[PDB]
Design an enzyme around this catalytic site. Structure first.
Site, PDB file in Angstrom:
ATOM      1  N   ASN A  19      31.297  22.046 -14.154  1.00  0.00           N
ATOM      2  CA  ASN A  19      31.718  22.994 -12.909  1.00  0.00           C
ATOM      3  C   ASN A  19      30.515  23.355 -11.711  1.00  0.00           C
ATOM      4  N   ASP A  29      20.435  17.720   2.125  1.00  0.00           N
ATOM      5  CA  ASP A  29      21.858  17.547   2.041  1.00  0.00           C
ATOM      6  C   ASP A  29      22.648  18.547   2.641  1.00  0.00           C
ATOM      7  N   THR A  54      36.249  23.378  -7.307  1.00  0.00           N
ATOM      8  CA  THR A  54      35.092  23.512  -6.139  1.00  0.00           C
ATOM      9  C   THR A  54      35.099  24.736  -5.571  1.00  0.00           C
ATOM     10  N   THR A 143      26.562  11.366   0.998  1.00  0.00           N
ATOM     11  CA  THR A 143      25.263  11.320   0.582  1.00  0.00           C
ATOM     12  C   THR A 143      25.134  10.595  -0.656  1.00  0.00           C
ATOM     13  N   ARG A 244       1.461 -27.351   5.005  1.00  0.00           N
ATOM     14  CA  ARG A 244       0.777 -27.781   3.748  1.00  0.00           C
ATOM     15  C   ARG A 244       1.781 -28.322   2.540  1.00  0.00           C
ATOM     16  N   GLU A 281      -0.106  -7.213 -11.321  1.00  0.00           N
ATOM     17  CA  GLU A 281      -1.071  -8.040 -10.397  1.00  0.00           C
ATOM     18  C   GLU A 281      -2.137  -6.865  -9.687  1.00  0.00           C
ATOM     19  N   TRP A 303       0.988 -16.701 -10.665  1.00  0.00           N
ATOM     20  CA  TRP A 303      -0.408 -17.546 -10.623  1.00  0.00           C
ATOM     21  C   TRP A 303      -0.275 -18.797 -11.194  1.00  0.00           C
ATOM     22  N   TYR A 329      -8.877 -12.580  -4.887  1.00  0.00           N
ATOM     23  CA  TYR A 329      -8.833 -11.166  -4.307  1.00  0.00           C
ATOM     24  C   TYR A 329      -9.681 -10.246  -4.751  1.00  0.00           C
ATOM     25  N   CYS A 389      -3.729 -14.802   1.305  1.00  0.00           N
ATOM     26  CA  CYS A 389      -2.893 -14.322   2.361  1.00  0.00           C
ATOM     27  C   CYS A 389      -3.040 -12.977   2.765  1.00  0.00           C
ATOM     28  N   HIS A 390      -3.022 -11.899   2.113  1.00  0.00           N
ATOM     29  CA  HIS A 390      -3.158 -10.702   2.379  1.00  0.00           C
ATOM     30  C   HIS A 390      -4.794 -10.563   2.243  1.00  0.00           C
ATOM     31  N   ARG A 410      -2.365 -13.260   6.938  1.00  0.00           N
ATOM     32  CA  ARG A 410      -2.609 -14.393   7.699  1.00  0.00           C
ATOM     33  C   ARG A 410      -1.188 -15.131   7.453  1.00  0.00           C
ATOM     34  N   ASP A 413       5.397 -15.462   3.306  1.00  0.00           N
ATOM     35  CA  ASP A 413       6.479 -16.175   3.107  1.00  0.00           C
ATOM     36  C   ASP A 413       7.516 -15.168   3.114  1.00  0.00           C
ATOM     37  N   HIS A 451       6.991 -16.902   8.210  1.00  0.00           N
ATOM     38  CA  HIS A 451       7.555 -17.863   8.169  1.00  0.00           C
ATOM     39  C   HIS A 451       8.710 -17.852   7.135  1.00  0.00           C
TER      40      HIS A 451
HETATM   41  N1  LIG Z   1      28.773  16.438  -5.435  1.00  0.00           N
HETATM   42  C1  LIG Z   1      29.629  16.583  -4.427  1.00  0.00           C
HETATM   43  O1  LIG Z   1      29.851  16.119  -3.245  1.00  0.00           O
HETATM   44  C2  LIG Z   1      30.888  17.477  -4.808  1.00  0.00           C
HETATM   45  C3  LIG Z   1      30.802  18.198  -5.813  1.00  0.00           C
HETATM   46  N2  LIG Z   1      31.740  19.000  -6.443  1.00  0.00           N
HETATM   47  C4  LIG Z   1      31.802  19.226  -7.860  1.00  0.00           C
HETATM   48  O2  LIG Z   1      33.059  18.785  -8.319  1.00  0.00           O
HETATM   49  C5  LIG Z   1      33.706  19.797  -9.514  1.00  0.00           C
HETATM   50  C6  LIG Z   1      34.960  20.337  -9.021  1.00  0.00           C
HETATM   51  O3  LIG Z   1      35.772  19.257  -8.853  1.00  0.00           O
HETATM   52  P1  LIG Z   1      37.107  19.081  -9.793  1.00  0.00           P
HETATM   53  O4  LIG Z   1      36.718  19.190 -11.126  1.00  0.00           O
HETATM   54  O5  LIG Z   1      37.556  17.480  -9.563  1.00  0.00           O
HETATM   55  O6  LIG Z   1      38.246  19.921  -9.170  1.00  0.00           O
HETATM   56  P2  LIG Z   1      38.933  19.999  -7.984  1.00  0.00           P
HETATM   57  O7  LIG Z   1      38.132  20.650  -6.676  1.00  0.00           O
HETATM   58  O8  LIG Z   1      39.493  18.905  -7.731  1.00  0.00           O
HETATM   59  O9  LIG Z   1      39.934  21.361  -7.946  1.00  0.00           O
HETATM   60  C7  LIG Z   1      40.821  20.943  -9.168  1.00  0.00           C
HETATM   61  C8  LIG Z   1      42.118  21.805  -9.109  1.00  0.00           C
HETATM   62  O10 LIG Z   1      42.523  21.857  -7.662  1.00  0.00           O
HETATM   63  C9  LIG Z   1      43.781  21.646  -7.818  1.00  0.00           C
HETATM   64  N3  LIG Z   1      44.134  20.563  -7.101  1.00  0.00           N
HETATM   65  C10 LIG Z   1      43.319  19.531  -7.128  1.00  0.00           C
HETATM   66  N4  LIG Z   1      43.898  18.506  -6.685  1.00  0.00           N
HETATM   67  C11 LIG Z   1      45.198  18.609  -6.485  1.00  0.00           C
HETATM   68  C12 LIG Z   1      46.322  17.928  -6.481  1.00  0.00           C
HETATM   69  N5  LIG Z   1      46.448  16.656  -5.857  1.00  0.00           N
HETATM   70  N6  LIG Z   1      47.403  18.444  -6.514  1.00  0.00           N
HETATM   71  C13 LIG Z   1      47.431  19.844  -6.663  1.00  0.00           C
HETATM   72  N7  LIG Z   1      46.659  20.760  -7.159  1.00  0.00           N
HETATM   73  C14 LIG Z   1      45.298  19.857  -7.101  1.00  0.00           C
HETATM   74  C15 LIG Z   1      44.325  22.283  -8.999  1.00  0.00           C
HETATM   75  O11 LIG Z   1      44.045  23.723  -9.035  1.00  0.00           O
HETATM   76  P3  LIG Z   1      45.145  24.389 -10.223  1.00  0.00           P
HETATM   77  O12 LIG Z   1      45.003  23.813 -11.448  1.00  0.00           O
HETATM   78  O13 LIG Z   1      44.854  25.990 -10.088  1.00  0.00           O
HETATM   79  O14 LIG Z   1      46.642  24.074  -9.717  1.00  0.00           O
HETATM   80  C16 LIG Z   1      43.228  21.497  -9.826  1.00  0.00           C
HETATM   81  O15 LIG Z   1      43.235  22.199 -11.227  1.00  0.00           O
HETATM   82  C17 LIG Z   1      32.307  20.494  -9.652  1.00  0.00           C
HETATM   83  O16 LIG Z   1      31.597  20.244 -10.690  1.00  0.00           O
HETATM   84  C18 LIG Z   1      31.692  20.526  -8.290  1.00  0.00           C
HETATM   85  O17 LIG Z   1      30.461  21.163  -8.343  1.00  0.00           O
HETATM   86  C19 LIG Z   1      32.741  19.421  -5.539  1.00  0.00           C
HETATM   87  C20 LIG Z   1      32.862  18.914  -4.234  1.00  0.00           C
HETATM   88  C21 LIG Z   1      31.903  17.960  -3.973  1.00  0.00           C
HETATM   89  C1  LIG Z   2       3.178 -12.102  -2.727  1.00  0.00           C
HETATM   90  C2  LIG Z   2       2.816 -12.219  -3.795  1.00  0.00           C
HETATM   91  C3  LIG Z   2       2.164 -12.670  -5.053  1.00  0.00           C
HETATM   92  N1  LIG Z   2       2.694 -14.159  -5.538  1.00  0.00           N
HETATM   93  C4  LIG Z   2       1.710 -15.028  -5.336  1.00  0.00           C
HETATM   94  C5  LIG Z   2       2.082 -16.310  -4.581  1.00  0.00           C
HETATM   95  C6  LIG Z   2       1.688 -17.602  -4.710  1.00  0.00           C
HETATM   96  C7  LIG Z   2       2.082 -18.450  -4.028  1.00  0.00           C
HETATM   97  C8  LIG Z   2       3.085 -18.639  -2.982  1.00  0.00           C
HETATM   98  N2  LIG Z   2       3.523 -19.501  -2.427  1.00  0.00           N
HETATM   99  C9  LIG Z   2       4.569 -19.270  -1.362  1.00  0.00           C
HETATM  100  N3  LIG Z   2       4.912 -20.283  -0.881  1.00  0.00           N
HETATM  101  N4  LIG Z   2       5.167 -18.095  -1.344  1.00  0.00           N
HETATM  102  C10 LIG Z   2       4.800 -17.320  -1.980  1.00  0.00           C
HETATM  103  O1  LIG Z   2       5.528 -15.915  -1.913  1.00  0.00           O
HETATM  104  C11 LIG Z   2       3.572 -17.301  -2.715  1.00  0.00           C
HETATM  105  C12 LIG Z   2       3.296 -16.038  -3.663  1.00  0.00           C
HETATM  106  C13 LIG Z   2       3.935 -14.206  -6.083  1.00  0.00           C
HETATM  107  C14 LIG Z   2       4.320 -15.303  -6.522  1.00  0.00           C
HETATM  108  C15 LIG Z   2       5.519 -15.747  -7.067  1.00  0.00           C
HETATM  109  C16 LIG Z   2       6.266 -14.512  -7.174  1.00  0.00           C
HETATM  110  C17 LIG Z   2       7.875 -14.869  -7.476  1.00  0.00           C
HETATM  111  O2  LIG Z   2       8.087 -15.352  -8.554  1.00  0.00           O
HETATM  112  N5  LIG Z   2       8.512 -13.688  -7.314  1.00  0.00           N
HETATM  113  C18 LIG Z   2       9.634 -13.001  -8.168  1.00  0.00           C
HETATM  114  C19 LIG Z   2      10.409 -12.144  -7.482  1.00  0.00           C
HETATM  115  C20 LIG Z   2       9.756 -11.353  -6.435  1.00  0.00           C
HETATM  116  C21 LIG Z   2      10.425 -10.639  -5.240  1.00  0.00           C
HETATM  117  O3  LIG Z   2      11.502 -10.220  -5.542  1.00  0.00           O
HETATM  118  O4  LIG Z   2      10.138 -10.996  -4.028  1.00  0.00           O
HETATM  119  C22 LIG Z   2      10.348 -14.008  -9.192  1.00  0.00           C
HETATM  120  O5  LIG Z   2      10.742 -13.618 -10.160  1.00  0.00           O
HETATM  121  O6  LIG Z   2      10.649 -15.106  -8.539  1.00  0.00           O
HETATM  122  C23 LIG Z   2       6.144 -13.323  -6.542  1.00  0.00           C
HETATM  123  C24 LIG Z   2       4.924 -13.146  -5.934  1.00  0.00           C
HETATM  124  C1  LIG Z   3      22.015  26.199  -6.046  1.00  0.00           C
HETATM  125  C2  LIG Z   3      23.023  25.630  -5.062  1.00  0.00           C
HETATM  126  N1  LIG Z   3      24.250  25.393  -5.635  1.00  0.00           N
HETATM  127  C3  LIG Z   3      25.343  25.029  -4.680  1.00  0.00           C
HETATM  128  C4  LIG Z   3      25.206  25.508  -3.372  1.00  0.00           C
HETATM  129  C5  LIG Z   3      26.356  25.261  -2.489  1.00  0.00           C
HETATM  130  C6  LIG Z   3      26.845  26.155  -1.606  1.00  0.00           C
HETATM  131  C7  LIG Z   3      27.805  25.755  -0.740  1.00  0.00           C
HETATM  132  C8  LIG Z   3      28.850  24.807  -1.041  1.00  0.00           C
HETATM  133  C9  LIG Z   3      28.497  23.930  -2.168  1.00  0.00           C
HETATM  134  N2  LIG Z   3      29.117  22.880  -2.673  1.00  0.00           N
HETATM  135  C10 LIG Z   3      28.806  21.728  -3.539  1.00  0.00           C
HETATM  136  C11 LIG Z   3      29.423  20.293  -2.937  1.00  0.00           C
HETATM  137  N3  LIG Z   3      29.538  20.589  -1.319  1.00  0.00           N
HETATM  138  C12 LIG Z   3      29.098  19.329  -1.045  1.00  0.00           C
HETATM  139  C13 LIG Z   3      27.673  19.262  -0.966  1.00  0.00           C
HETATM  140  N4  LIG Z   3      27.115  17.824  -0.207  1.00  0.00           N
HETATM  141  C14 LIG Z   3      27.901  17.293   0.287  1.00  0.00           C
HETATM  142  N5  LIG Z   3      27.492  16.232   0.940  1.00  0.00           N
HETATM  143  N6  LIG Z   3      29.274  17.167   0.433  1.00  0.00           N
HETATM  144  C15 LIG Z   3      29.947  18.389  -0.053  1.00  0.00           C
HETATM  145  N7  LIG Z   3      31.232  18.566  -0.032  1.00  0.00           N
HETATM  146  C16 LIG Z   3      30.073  21.555  -0.731  1.00  0.00           C
HETATM  147  C17 LIG Z   3      30.566  22.675  -1.713  1.00  0.00           C
HETATM  148  C18 LIG Z   3      27.324  24.307  -2.796  1.00  0.00           C
HETATM  149  C19 LIG Z   3      24.121  25.953  -2.915  1.00  0.00           C
HETATM  150  N8  LIG Z   3      22.822  26.019  -3.854  1.00  0.00           N
HETATM  151  O1  LIG Z   4       0.386 -12.654  -1.222  1.00  0.00           O
HETATM  152  C1  LIG Z   4       0.799 -13.662  -0.990  1.00  0.00           C
HETATM  153  C2  LIG Z   4       0.270 -14.874  -1.253  1.00  0.00           C
HETATM  154  C3  LIG Z   4       1.061 -15.985  -0.833  1.00  0.00           C
HETATM  155  N1  LIG Z   4       1.818 -16.052   0.164  1.00  0.00           N
HETATM  156  C4  LIG Z   4       2.418 -17.483   0.682  1.00  0.00           C
HETATM  157  C5  LIG Z   4       2.052 -17.368   2.053  1.00  0.00           C
HETATM  158  C6  LIG Z   4       2.584 -19.021   2.246  1.00  0.00           C
HETATM  159  O2  LIG Z   4       3.894 -19.328   2.380  1.00  0.00           O
HETATM  160  C7  LIG Z   4       1.785 -19.423   0.880  1.00  0.00           C
HETATM  161  C8  LIG Z   4       0.438 -19.989   1.072  1.00  0.00           C
HETATM  162  O3  LIG Z   4       0.238 -21.111   1.863  1.00  0.00           O
HETATM  163  P1  LIG Z   4      -0.860 -20.992   3.097  1.00  0.00           P
HETATM  164  O4  LIG Z   4      -0.640 -20.068   3.751  1.00  0.00           O
HETATM  165  O5  LIG Z   4      -2.080 -21.181   2.274  1.00  0.00           O
HETATM  166  O6  LIG Z   4      -0.514 -22.382   3.821  1.00  0.00           O
HETATM  167  O7  LIG Z   4       1.977 -18.362  -0.140  1.00  0.00           O
HETATM  168  C9  LIG Z   4       2.514 -14.883   0.670  1.00  0.00           C
HETATM  169  O8  LIG Z   4       3.369 -14.615   1.441  1.00  0.00           O
HETATM  170  N2  LIG Z   4       1.993 -13.631   0.067  1.00  0.00           N
END
Ligand SMILES: NC(=O)C1=CN([C@@H]2O[C@H](COP(=O)(O)OP(=O)(O)OC[C@H]3O[C@@H](n4cnc5c(N)ncnc54)[C@H](OP(=O)(O)O)[C@@H]3O)[C@@H](O)[C@H]2O)C=CC1
Ligand SMILES: C#CCN(Cc1ccc2[nH]c(N)nc(=O)c2c1)c1ccc(C(=O)N[C@@H](CCC(=O)O)C(=O)O)cc1
Ligand SMILES: Cc1ncc(-c2cccc(N3CCN(c4cnc(N)nc4N)CC3)c2)cn1
Ligand SMILES: O=c1ccn([C@H]2C[C@H](O)[C@@H](COP(=O)(O)O)O2)c(=O)[nH]1
Ligand SMILES: NC(=O)C1=CN([C@@H]2O[C@H](COP(=O)(O)OP(=O)(O)OC[C@H]3O[C@@H](n4cnc5c(N)ncnc54)[C@H](OP(=O)(O)O)[C@@H]3O)[C@@H](O)[C@H]2O)C=CC1
Ligand SMILES: C#CCN(Cc1ccc2[nH]c(N)nc(=O)c2c1)c1ccc(C(=O)N[C@@H](CCC(=O)O)C(=O)O)cc1
Ligand SMILES: Cc1ncc(-c2cccc(N3CCN(c4cnc(N)nc4N)CC3)c2)cn1
Ligand SMILES: O=c1ccn([C@H]2C[C@H](O)[C@@H](COP(=O)(O)O)O2)c(=O)[nH]1
Lengths: 510, 510
Positions: A19, A29, A54, A143, A244, A281, A303, A329, A389-390, A410, A413, A451
Site C-alpha cells: 500500500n 515525477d 490510493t 511516467t 573499400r 574494449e 576485432w 588506438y 575511426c574515432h 572520420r 558505420d 554512412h
Molecule cells: N505508481 C503509481 O502511479 C500509483 C501508485 N499507486 C499505488 O497503488 C496501490 C493502491 O492501488 P490498489 O491497491 O489497486 O487500490 P485502489 O486504489 O484501486 O483501491 C481499491 C479499492 O477501491 C475501491 N475500488 C477500486 N476499483 C473499484 C471498482 N472498479 N469498483 C468498486 N470499487 C472499486 C474499493 O474500495 P472498497 O473495498 O472500500 O469498496 C477497492 O477495494 C498503492 O500501493 C499505491 O501506492 C496508486 C496510484 C498510482
Molecule cells: C564501433 C566499434 C568497435 N568495433 C570495431 C569495428 C571494426 C570494424 C568495423 N567495420 C564496419 N564496417 N563497421 C563497424 O562498425 C566496425 C567496427 C565493433 C565491431 C563489431 C561490433 C559488433 O559486432 N557489434 C555487436 C553489437 C553492438 C551494437 O549494438 O552496436 C554485435 O554483437 O554484433 C561492435 C563494435
Molecule cells: C514520500 C512520499 N510518498 C508519497 C507521496 C505522495 C503524495 C501525493 C500523492 C501520491 N500518490 C502516489 C501515486 N500518485 C501518482 C504519482 N505519479 C504519477 N505519475 N501518477 C500518480 N497517480 C498520486 C498519488 C504520493 C509523496 N511523498
Molecule cells: O570504432 C569504429 C571502428 C570502425 N567503424 C567503421 C567505420 C567504417 O564503416 C569502417 C572502417 O572503414 P574505413 O572507414 O577505414 O574505410 O568501420 C566505426 O564506425 N567505428
C-alpha cells in the site's frame, strides 16, 4: 467527458507494494503529477478520481490533494469518515465518495457540469482497469520508471503496452528525455487513444522553397531521436557510393549529436547494445593493449576479422602475429609515437602518455584548451591493422566542475558502430570525471563520413518503427578504491534500468 | 499599397544604354517572375516607364499573366495593340500619363481584379513612387559587383544595405547567389516609422526559463547569420571563465557552422576580413614554412606576438630564433613527424607529406574515408611556439565530383580568429578542388572551445547591429598554369564583389 489517466510504472507495469510506492521519492515525477493535475486556463478546477487504498496510501499532509476536487471510489468509506479525518480548508472542495467509476463520472456530470475542467484518474489498479474497460480514457500520462522494483499491484495490460517493455490502441505522441532521482531513471510519455509583414516575405520564400522514425511521436525530447533521425536523414538525403568493402554505402558528410551524462547514460534502447563489448574494449584501450586475443578470449570478438592471417596480409603485414592490431588506438593514447615491435613488448615510458597528460591538466589547470587525445599518427598508419575511426577527443570543464567531451570520428558505420562509439566515449567521460573529481555533463559526437551500408537499410527501417525506452544509469562501483584511470576493472560498473528492444542482426563489413 | 522591384549595384546603378549593366542573372529573373506573378481570380499589376518597356525584348513583352501599365505621354495604347498579336486570357496593356494616373486607373477600373501593384522601373518611376511615399516594400536584388551605369536608383533612408556611406528596414536577407561571375542576393525592405492541449501542461513545467543580431530581419537566409547567431549564443548562454591569457573569456563547447562554396565565397561582410592575410598565411602553410618573418615582411603580422624573444622564453624555447614557430602547422602538413632543427633547414623528403597524400587519394580513389590532414603531433607540441588551433581537416567527394571539407578547431577566438579561419579553409578547399579536377561544394567548421574575449564584447555588439552584404566570389586566375598545390602564387586569386562594413579593431590576446 473524456478522462485522462496519470500513472508511474515499472517496465513490468508495477505501481505499488504494501500500500505504498515501490521506489524512493522521484521529485520530478511529483512535480509533473502536481503540474498536470492542477494546471487549467476561468474559475474552472480539475478533478482527481482515486480508489480507497490510493487515498489511504497518500500521506495525511498531502490529502486531500489541494486545488483539485477529490473523488474517492469506495463502498466502505463514507464522506463523513473523510470529513472527520481532517478539517476541510476554506476555499477547497469537500471530498466526494462514489460506489464505482461510472458513478464518479455521473456525479461529475450531474453536480459539477460548470465547475470542473479536466478529469484525471489517479489510481489504483481498480480504477485504471475500469477506466480502460469503459473506454473513457483519451490520454495516458505515463511516467516510465526504468528500474524494476518489488510490486504487488500492477497497471493493467493495454494495447500499446510495448512502450514499457518487450512482449483501439494507445500510441505515444510525446516522449521526453530521461530524468533521474535517487538513482532511478525515468521519463514521461503521453499516449493517445487511436483506432502584411509575412505576406510580403511569402512570394520570395515560395520560389526558394521519405522515411521518418515513429512519426506519430510529435514531441521528440528523447535524445535517442538524434540517432534515429540521423538514420532517416542519411537514407532520405544521402548519396549512394562504393567504398573499400565492396558493399554499397549511402553517405553524408559532417554530422553531429550530443548526449547528456548528468541524469542518465546514452545506451541506445531501440536495439540492445553490446555493453560487455564497450566496457572490455575501453579497458583494453586504456591499458595500451594491442593484442585482440585478450578481447576474443573474454567473448569480445569485435576485432577478430581485422586481425586474421588473411586480413593482416591484405595489409602487407606478414610479420604480424594473429591478433596484433599494431600501434592502434590504446598504443597511441598511452605511447604516442613510440616505435612498435609487437603486442608482447613492454612499452612503459616510451612515447607520449596523452591520457595521463589530459588527466593531470584536468586536475591542475582545467581551463587549459589543449586537453586532447589523438590516435591519428600518420607515421604509424601503415603498421596498423586499421586506421582509427574515432581519432580525436577533447575535454572541457566549465565553472561548475562539469566535464564535457567531444570525439571526432572520420568514418561512422551508423548501423553497427555508432551506438557502440556513443557508449564507449560516454563511459570514458564518466571514468575521467570520477578520477578528476568532476561531474560528467555531456558527450558530443562529431562525425565525418557518416554512412549506412546497403545491406543494413531494411533492418534499420524496422528499427525506426520502435519508440525509445528511457536510458539506463551507469554507476561506478567501489569509488573509494578507484583513484587513477588504471584502477578501473570490468567489475566496477553497474548498468541500471536498461530495457532495450531486441537485438537486430547486422553483418560487419570487413 | 505599392511595392518596388529592382536590381542594383552597390552604388545604386540600374542601367546603361537603355539596357541592364550586367550579363544575364538567371536566378534574378526567376525571382522577378515569381514575385510579380504569385497571388481568387485576382492578377498582379506591373507598372513601368516607357524606356523600361522599350528596353525589354519583344519576346517577353507584355509580361505574361500580369496587367501591364506603361507610363508615357508619347506612346499610345493602340501602338501596343498592333505591336504584337494579343493572346486571350491576358489583359490589354494600359498607358497612363503619370504614376498618380496609373494608380487612379487601378482604383477606378481594376478595384478587385488585382491583388498587388509592382513598380518595375525605371528611375523615372522609382523616383516618383518614393516621392509620393506610396511604396510599402522594396524588393531589392543586390548585385555585389559594380558595373558601368548611366541610370541610378534614388538615394533612400536605409540605402546603407547597399554599401557604406520614415526609413526602409530589411525584413529578409537571402543567401548569396551567382550567375555569370556575378554575386548577388535578395532583400526585402519595409517602410518603417487536443493532441497539443494534452502535451501543453507537461511542456509548461519542463521549460522554467538577450542579444540578437539585427532582430528586425525575420528571414535569415544569409549564411553569415550562423556566425552572427554564434556570437549572440555565446554571449547569452556561455560561461565566464579565466584562461591562459589572463583576459576574461565567455565560452561554449562544441559548435558548428557550414558554408556553401559552389556559388560564392564566405568572406564575412559585417566587418572587413584581412584577405591578404588569409592568402599569404595559407601559401606559407602549404610551403611547410615556419619562419613568421616571411609573413611579417609582406605586411602580415599575425604571428609576430607569438614569436618574440619574450614569448618564446615564456615557452621555455630560449634556443629559438625570433620568428621561428617551431614545427607548427605547415611543417606537420608537409613533413609530419620529421625532426625539427630550425626554420632555415631543408626538410625535403623527411616525414609524411599529408597534403600530397590527400591530393593523390582524391585524384585516384575519392571514396576512400581516410583523407585527413592533422597538425596535432603530441611529440612536437612543446617545440611549437603555439599548439595548433585548427588541428585536423577531412575531405569528401560525392557522386557529382563535388568536394567538401571539414576542419576541427580545438580553440576558437570567435571575434578575431573565426572569420579568418573560415576564409582560410574555404580557400584551401577551392585550391584542392581545382588541382584534383573537382567542384568545391562545402566547408564545414567543427569547433571545440568556442569563446569570445571579454574585451571584445562591446565591439561585437556593434557588429551585431549590421546587416550582412552579399558574399563575394573568389576566382582562381591562370587555372591552366596551375596543376599542383605548390603552383599557386599570391597573384593567382581575384576577389570579386566584396563590399564589407568597416574594419572593427580587436586586439589579439597574446
Ligand atoms: N505508481 C503509481 O502511479 C500509483 C501508485 N499507486 C499505488 O497503488 C496501490 C493502491 O492501488 P490498489 O491497491 O489497486 O487500490 P485502489 O486504489 O484501486 O483501491 C481499491 C479499492 O477501491 C475501491 N475500488 C477500486 N476499483 C473499484 C471498482 N472498479 N469498483 C468498486 N470499487 C472499486 C474499493 O474500495 P472498497 O473495498 O472500500 O469498496 C477497492 O477495494 C498503492 O500501493 C499505491 O501506492 C496508486 C496510484 C498510482
Ligand atoms: C564501433 C566499434 C568497435 N568495433 C570495431 C569495428 C571494426 C570494424 C568495423 N567495420 C564496419 N564496417 N563497421 C563497424 O562498425 C566496425 C567496427 C565493433 C565491431 C563489431 C561490433 C559488433 O559486432 N557489434 C555487436 C553489437 C553492438 C551494437 O549494438 O552496436 C554485435 O554483437 O554484433 C561492435 C563494435
Ligand atoms: C514520500 C512520499 N510518498 C508519497 C507521496 C505522495 C503524495 C501525493 C500523492 C501520491 N500518490 C502516489 C501515486 N500518485 C501518482 C504519482 N505519479 C504519477 N505519475 N501518477 C500518480 N497517480 C498520486 C498519488 C504520493 C509523496 N511523498
Ligand atoms: O570504432 C569504429 C571502428 C570502425 N567503424 C567503421 C567505420 C567504417 O564503416 C569502417 C572502417 O572503414 P574505413 O572507414 O577505414 O574505410 O568501420 C566505426 O564506425 N567505428
Ligand atoms: N536594374 C533594374 O532592376 C531595372 C533597370 N532598368 C533600366 O533603367 C533604364 C531605363 O530607366 P529610365 O531611363 O529611368 O526610364 P524609364 O523606364 O523610367 O522611362 C522614362 C520615361 O518615362 C516617362 N516618365 C518618367 N518619369 C515620369 C514621371 N514622373 N511622370 C510621368 N512620366 C514619367 C517619360 O516618358 P514620357 O515623356 O513619354 O512620359 C520618361 O522619359 C534602362 O537602362 C533599363 O534597363 C529598368 C528596369 C529595372
Ligand atoms: C585565425 C587566424 C589568423 N591569425 C593568427 C592568430 C594568432 C594568435 C591568435 N591569438 C588569439 N588569442 N586570437 C586569435 O584570433 C589569434 C590569431 C590572426 C592574428 C591576428 C589578427 C589581427 O590582429 N587582426 C586582423 C584582422 C583579421 C580579421 O578580420 O579577422 C588584422 O587585420 O590585423 C588576425 C588573424
Ligand atoms: C537577355 C535578357 N534580357 C532582358 C530580359 C528581361 C525580360 C523581362 C524583363 C526584364 N527587365 C530587366 C529588369 N527588371 C527587373 C529585373 N530584376 C529585378 N530584380 N527587378 C526588375 N525590375 C524588369 C525588366 C528583362 C531577359 N533576358
Ligand atoms: O587559427 C587560430 C589560431 C589561434 N586562435 C585563437 C584561439 C585562442 O583564443 C588562441 C589560442 O590560445 P590557446 O587555445 O592555446 O589557449 O588563439 C584562433 O582562433 N585561430
Amino acid at each position: 467527458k473524456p478522462v485522462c489517466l496519470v500513472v508511474a510504472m515499472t517496465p513490468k507495469r508495477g505501481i505499488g507494494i504494501n500500500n505504498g510506492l515501490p521506489w524512493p521519492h522521484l521529485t520530478t515525477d511529483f512535480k509533473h503529477f502536481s503540474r498536470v493535475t492542477k494546471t487549467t486556463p476561468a474559475s474552472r478546477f480539475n478533478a482527481v478520481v482515486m480508489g480507497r487504498k490510493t487515498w489511504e496510501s497518500m500521506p495525511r499532509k498531502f490529502r486531500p490533494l489541494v486545488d483539485r476536487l477529490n473523488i474517492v471510489v469506495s463502498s466502505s468509506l463514507k464522506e463523513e469518515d473523510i470529513a472527520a479525518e481532517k478539517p476541510q480548508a476554506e476555499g477547497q472542495q469537500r471530498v466526494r465518495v462514489c460506489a464505482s467509476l461510472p458513478a464518479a463520472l455521473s456525479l461529475l456530470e450531474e453536480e459539477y457540469k460548470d465547475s470542473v475542467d479536466q478529469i484525471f484518474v489517479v489510481g489504483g489498479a481498480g480504477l485504471y482497469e475500469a477506466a480502460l474497460s469503459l473506454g473513457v480514457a483519451s490520454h495516458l500520462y505515463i511516467t516510465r520508471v526504468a528500474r524494476e522494483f518489488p510490486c504487488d499491484v500492477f497497471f493493467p495490460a493495454f494495447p500499446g503496452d510495448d512502450i514499457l517493455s518487450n512482449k483501439a490502441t494507445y500510441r505515444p505522441i510525446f516522449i521526453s528525455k530521461t530524468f533521474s532521482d535517487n538513482g532511478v531513471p525515468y521519463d514521461f510519455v503521453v499516449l493517445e487513444k487511436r483506432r502584411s509583414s509575412a505576406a510580403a516575405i511569402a512570394p520570395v520564400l515560395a520560389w526558394m522553397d521519405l522515411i521518418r522514425a515513429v512519426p506519430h511521436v510529435h514531441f521528440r525530447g528523447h535524445e535517442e531521436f538524434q540517432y534515429l533521425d540521423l538514420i532517416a536523414d542519411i537514407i532520405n538525403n544521402g548519396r549512394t557510393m562504393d567504398d573499400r568493402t565492396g558493399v554499397g554505402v549511402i553517405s553524408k558528410f559532417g554530422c553531429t549529436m550530443r548526449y547528456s551524462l548528468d541524469q542518465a547514460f546514452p545506451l541506445l534502447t531501440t536495439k540492445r547494445v553490446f555493453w560487455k563489448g564497450v566496457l572490455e574494449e575501453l579497458l583494453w584501450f586504456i591499458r595500451g593493449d594491442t593484442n585482440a586475443n585478450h578481447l576474443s578470449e573474454k567473448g569480445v570478438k569485435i576485432w577478430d576479422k581485422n586481425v586474421t592471417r588473411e586480413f593482416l596480409d591484405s595489409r602487407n603485414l606478414p610479420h604480424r602475429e594473429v591478433g596484433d592490431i599494431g600501434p592502434g588506438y590504446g598504443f597511441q593514447w598511452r605511447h604516442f609515437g613510440a616505435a612498435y615491435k609487437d603486442m608482447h613488448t613492454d612499452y612503459t615510458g616510451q612515447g607520449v602518455d596523452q591520457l595521463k597528460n589530459v588527466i593531470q591538466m584536468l586536475r591542475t589547470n582545467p581551463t587549459d584548451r589543449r586537453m586532447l587525445m589523438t590516435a591519428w599518427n600518420p607515421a604509424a598508419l601503415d603498421e596498423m591493422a586499421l586506421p582509427p575511426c574515432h581519432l580525436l577527443c577533447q575535454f572541457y570543464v566549465n565553472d561548475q566542475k562539469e566535464l564535457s567531451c567531444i570525439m571526432y570520428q572520420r568514418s561512422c558505420d551508423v548501423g553497427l558502430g555508432v551506438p557502440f562509439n556513443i557508449a564507449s566515449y560516454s563511459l570514458l567521460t564518466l571514468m575521467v570525471a570520477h578520477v578528476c573529481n568532476l561531474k560528467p555533463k555531456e558527450f558530443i559526437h562529431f562525425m565525418g563520413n557518416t554512412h549506412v551500408y546497403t545491406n543494413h537499410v531494411e533492418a534499420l527501417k524496422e528499427q525506426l518503427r520502435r519508440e525509445p525506452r528511457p536510458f539506463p544509469i551507469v554507476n561506478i562501483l567501489n569509488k573509494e578504491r578507484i583513484k587513477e584511470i588504471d584502477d578501473f576493472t570490468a567489475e566496477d560498473f553497474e548498468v541500471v534500468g536498461y530495457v532495450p528492444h531486441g537485438r537486430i542482426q547486422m553483418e560487419m563489413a570487413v
